[PDB]
């Protein structure tokens, strides 16, 4: 048969199910960032644990060891490109000292809100879900998008999505067709 299809999990549940402080922190994050469920925090903490593991493996190696140099430079490049690691923290220890909010900030549901394109994070969530936001010449309907710090200058509405161009919408048309009658004629 055909070669197997590789697939991996993207999250990890907490070991203690009912830790009240962790529950309150997760709910704080979900309310601030408009998250659907705890699984999104789980996924971000899983990504952060993988990043931290790689950074720890590299930091245990000798400095100027070629593998450490190459792979740490690549990891730092990826993080600063995504905007999670700041511009002045390119040291592979700030990679260790990152946080969940540093990844939740680069979410498109957060960038759309912080760019004034939406009134709240939930407005941003529904606006991305409803195909209203385009990153480049490409509609992006996925809240978790991890803007590349260059798409930030390009996150605007689509030529579709009647907030940034041609069409007037769907319920506007029916309300016009019924306001024609409501006018009396």
């Amino acid at each position: 048969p055909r070669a197997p299809r590789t697939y991996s999990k993207t999250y990890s549940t907490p070991k203690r199910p009912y830790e009240s402080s962790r529950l309150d922190a997760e709910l704080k994050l979900a309310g601030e960032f408009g998250l659907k469920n705890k699984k999104e925090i789980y996924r971000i903490s899983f990504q952060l644990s993988k990043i931290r593991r790689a950074a720890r493996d590299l930091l245990t190696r000798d400095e100027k060891d070629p593998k450490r140099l190459f792979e740490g430079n690549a990891l730092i490049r990826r993080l600063v490109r995504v905007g999670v690691l700041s511009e002045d923290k390119k040291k592979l220890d700030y990679v260790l000292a990152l946080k969940v909010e540093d990844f939740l900030e680069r979410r498109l549901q957060t960038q759309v809100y912080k760019l004034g394109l939406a009134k709240s994070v939930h407005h941003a969530r529904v606006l991305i879900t409803q195909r209203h936001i385009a990153v480049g010449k490409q509609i992006v309907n996925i809240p978790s998008f991890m803007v590349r710090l260059d798409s930030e200058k390009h996150i605007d509405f689509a030529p579709t999505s009647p907030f940034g161009g041609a069409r007037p919408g769907r319920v506007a048309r029916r309300n016009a067709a019924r306001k024609a009658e409501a006018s009396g004629e």
Binding site: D24, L27, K28, A30, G31, L35, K36, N37, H122, R125
Partner: protein
């Protein structure tokens, strides 16, 4: 001794439900919980509480 298998469930009044507006399932429900819990609504009773009495 059988023939007593319903001495509570069967002989308990059949109170019906109460039709109420649906809950906003999902991200909306997470937002509802967040506002209910972390805007410091009057539910403290000294330190914290999540039910009346």
């Amino acid at each position: 001794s059988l023939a007593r298998a319903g001495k509570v469930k069967s002989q308990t009044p059949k109170v019906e439900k109460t039709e109420k507006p649906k809950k906003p399932k999902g991200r909306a429900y997470k937002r509802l919980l967040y506002t209910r819990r972390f805007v410091n609504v009057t539910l403290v009773n000294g330190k914290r509480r999540m039910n009346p009495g």
